Design a protein around this ligand. Structure first.
Ligand SMILES: [Cl-]
Ligand SMILES: [Cl-]
Ligand SMILES: [Cl-]
Ligand SMILES: [Cl-]
Lengths: 198, 198
């Protein structure tokens, strides 16, 4: 088949969905593209390079709320960017595992830069802007990984038998959205406090 | 060597530290214990069973702040339990990945039960108690996974070149502790609000 970057990534994401991250190999990708493994190697050197590229492409294709809108509040921005990040990770099988394994791109750096500038323009120190973005990112990756890795591996007390029911309710969105508001409000409280004991 | 449960788990955790989760195999474990693979199988059927057991043992050995102290506030409890959970995951290589792959034990259920009862005794609804515990857990697993998976794979803008410096500062503790306070304060605000628009 055609072996330009875009076509290779397309095939690899389709494979990812069929196999999961642990099952994804260059040998299967070559089979999927109708080529010998040495032909693939010219284009993609190893699994690591493949996954690095997938991780970037997934956000490039699907994380379309990475930047604030004209006039958006920083609360609203973090909320929107978290939801979008979440959706993008969930779009592919083991997507969050794919994401975790990566160090960031230059574009992601331009984008992260604009995000930190935005935060600091809104009254955050560099540190606190970064801490906030990091905590959203951690909380989001954590929740998706649990949603996703719940599937990988496949008699209860009053509250817990039922904790499990409350959860086997939707995909994880309610709990996710609820903790997200709690986090943002926490940041609010912090930012508003300035040097006052809080 | 001796092949009681405890000895097998000990050897397996030591192997985990030498190999990481992806590198851990029953064949290496058997070599480490001085036995043939069919002998090991009697004791541990596969990698999956092995990892399930490790995940439980790691928290049993090292997550020693899983329950509130006499008279402890729920804020203080979540803070302490988060720090402890964090430390336990960090104690072994790929520890958070080990943890993620698991569904919980019966003991973890007794323990989680007591935690949800504690939360509800303090004024949380079941839902909100669960949402809070989940968000702490997600945020913590997220942060540790990034700390840890930062290692697995091994020119910057004013703020970001420096975002990276702020981070390459400690292990992740500062950012973690800071987001943890933000989360707890968010829960506080929520709980205190009752039915008032907040
Ligand atoms: Cl073609
Ligand atoms: Cl081509
Ligand atoms: Cl012996
Ligand atoms: Cl024995």
């Amino acid at each position: 088949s055609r072996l330009n970057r875009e076509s290779v990534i397309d095939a690899a994401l389709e494979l990812l969905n069929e196999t999961g991250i642990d099952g994804l190999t260059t040998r299967k990708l070559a089979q999927k593209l109708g080529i010998e493994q040495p032909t693939l190697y010219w284009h993609v050197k190893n699994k690591r390079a493949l996954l690095d590229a997938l991780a970037v492409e997934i956000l490039a294709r699907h994380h379309d709320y990475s930047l604030p809108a004209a006039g958006e509040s920083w609360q609203s921005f973090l909320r929107n960017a978290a939801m979008s990040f979440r959706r993008a990770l969930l779009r592919y099988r083991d997507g969050a595992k794919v994401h975790l394994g990566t160090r960031p791109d230059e574009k992601q750096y331009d984008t992260v830069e604009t995000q930190l500038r935005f935060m600091t323009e809104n009254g955050f120190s560099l540190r606190d802007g970064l801490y906030a973005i990091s905590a959203v990112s951690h909380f989001t990756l954590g929740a998706v990984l649990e949603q996703q890795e719940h599937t990988a591996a496949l008699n209860l007390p009053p509250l817990l038998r039922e904790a499990l029911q409350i959860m086997d309710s939707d995909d994880g969105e309610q709990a996710f959205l609820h903790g997200l508001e709690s986090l943002i409000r926490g940041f609010e409280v912090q930012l508003t406090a300035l040097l006052q004991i809080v």
